[PDB]
Amino acid sequence: RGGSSTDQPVANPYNTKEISLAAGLVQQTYCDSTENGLKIGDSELLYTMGEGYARQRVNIYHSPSLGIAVAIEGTNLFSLNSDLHDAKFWQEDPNERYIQYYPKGTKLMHGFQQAYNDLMDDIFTAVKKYKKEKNEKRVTVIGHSLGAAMGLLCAMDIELRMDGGLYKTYLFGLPRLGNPTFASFVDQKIGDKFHSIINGRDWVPTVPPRALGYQHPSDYVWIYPGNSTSAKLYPGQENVHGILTVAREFNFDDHQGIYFHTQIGAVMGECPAQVGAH
Numbered sequence: 001r002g003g004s005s006t007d008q009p010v011a012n013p014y015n016t017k018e019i020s021l022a023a024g025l026v027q028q029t030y031c032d033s034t035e036n037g038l039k040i041g042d043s044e045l046l047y048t049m050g051e052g053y054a055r056q057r058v059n060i061y062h063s064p065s066l067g068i069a070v071a072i073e074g075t076n077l078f079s080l081n082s083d084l085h086d087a088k089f090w091q092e093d094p095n096e097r098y099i100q101y102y103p104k105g106t107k108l109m110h111g112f113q114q115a116y117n118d119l120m121d122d123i124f125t126a127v128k129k130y131k132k133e134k135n136e137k138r139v140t141v142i143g144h145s146l147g148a149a150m151g152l153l154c155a156m157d158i159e160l161r162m163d164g165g166l167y168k169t170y171l172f173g174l175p176r177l178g179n180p181t182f183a184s185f186v187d188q189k190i191g192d193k194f195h196s197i198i199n200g201r202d203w204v205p206t207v208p209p210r211a212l213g214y215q216h217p218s219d220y221v222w223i224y225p226g227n228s229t230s231a232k233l234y235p236g237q238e239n240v241h242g243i244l245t246v247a248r249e250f251n252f253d254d255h256q257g258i259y260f261h262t263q264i265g266a267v268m269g270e271c272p273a274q275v276g277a278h
């Protein structure tokens with residue numbers, strides 16, 4: 001609790017076709033998306049907002065396997081290896097909309113919370129529209145990169161504040177989001193709903209750093225080598241045996257790589273996204 005799990009890596013328990021799929025659903029947030037009727041894996045694109053310039057694109061899909069799926073783009077509205085003194089990187093209390101639901105002393109990174117906050121009323125409205133419209137009780141939140149941290153917060157919000165709560169969340173290249181209190185609270189509200197997938201030598205999962213008071217929730221699955229299908233699960237928070245044991249590269253190569261046969265290539269990858277293409 002605040003610590004670093006020393007536990008041994010296990011086989012990857014996650015459903016890889018669902019990981020594959022969610023990757024597709026999020027790659028698509030980098031493409032224009034009221035291309036109406038669009039189809040990605042088992043999924044129908046239902047709705048879209050934002051555009052990746054002032055807010056992240058968010059796509060709402062419907063999926064037989066993942067329910068109503070909310071995907072949050074993670075383009076670089078701001079930069080994660082810029083000057084770690086900027087207001088973007090400061091910890092702050094939960095927004096007043098949902099502070100009532102969190103332990104006391106939950107801190108969340110500003111850049112991520114502000115960016116979720118400019119989308120949260122619309123997301124909620126849209127998620128309710130299409131739940132009612134498709135008689136669907138499962139809500140899946142997906143994000144990549146900056147969208148991954150936003151997605152974590154969104155997934156928490158949905159669990160706490162939305163009726164029916166959360167089905168699952170798949171989170172790719174998840175930057176850190178909250179303090180140890182936040183990370184532990186995630187473990188307990190959505191621990192078993194939580195899926196954090198890291199590819200190769202990706203650096204993003206290491207920022208903002210722990211020195212500033214940030215802590216990942218428990219477990220990720222780490223795909224090494226990058227773009228392969230070998231993956232162990234590294235359990236507990238901030239597992240000493242994981243990603244840091246291999247040099248991080250300081251570009252977005254692995255970051256924008258192949259996650260169980262689907263490439264999340266971002267602005268420069270597949271549009272529309274192609275589930276299973278690789």
Ligand SMILES: *[C@@H]1O[C@H](CO)[C@@H](O[C@@H]2O[C@H](CO)[C@@H](O)[C@H](O)[C@H]2NC(C)=O)[C@H](O)[C@H]1NC(C)=O
Binds near residue numbers: 254257263265269
């Ligand atoms: C895994 O896949 C990605 C692309 O999906 C590879 O990254 C590319 O690498 C070259 C230089 O290394 C760049 O000029 C490209 O821009 C990269 N593509 C993207 C989309 O970023 C990556 O190197 C592969 N990783 C491994 C370990 O083989």
Ligand SMILES: *[C@H]1O[C@H](CO)[C@@H](O)[C@H](O)[C@@H]1O
Binds near residue numbers: 005006007
């Ligand atoms: C790694 O080592 C720690 C303490 O060093 C144990 O608590 C843990 O369970 C693991 O074996």
